């Protein structure tokens, strides 16, 4: 019944390859989001300039 | 599967070195343009003078 001990090791592996990964689709998003942040930044200038001029 | 976390960091780097640079060929232009602005300025004088005289 080391087999159990085995099947234990199996069992603990059994419920070890499921739901043990939080928030990574969450995390990639941030950067994937933040990528979008990276772009309109330059627009701020003429926006300011417009506000600056006007 | 920190490898994922790794490959995530890779992945987020993956789509991080592409299209994250707005409008700079746009911006250089302005000055590159504005350089051209700098020159004919002096012509305005005799232009005025011509208008001034005449």
Description:
The structure is cut from a larger assembly and holds 2 copies of chain A (54 residues). The first copy, chain A, is mainly α. Chain A contains 3 helices and no strands. The A-B interface holds A 21, 24, 27-28, 31-32, 35, 38-43 and B 1, 4-5, 8, 11-12, 15-16, 19-20, 22-24, 27.
User: Which word captures the global form of chain A?
Assistant: rod-shaped
Largest sheet data of chain A = none
Largest binding interface between chains? A-B, 13 and 14 residues
Structural class of chain A: mainly alpha
Provide the gyration radius of chain A in Å: 26 Å
End-to-end CA span of chain A: 83 Å
Total count of helical runs of at least 4 residues of chain A: 3
Number of strands of chain A: 0
Order of helices and strands of chain A: HHH
Quaternary state of the chains: part of a larger assembly
Helix percent band of chain A: over 70%
Which band does the percent of strand residues of chain A land in?
Answer: under 5%
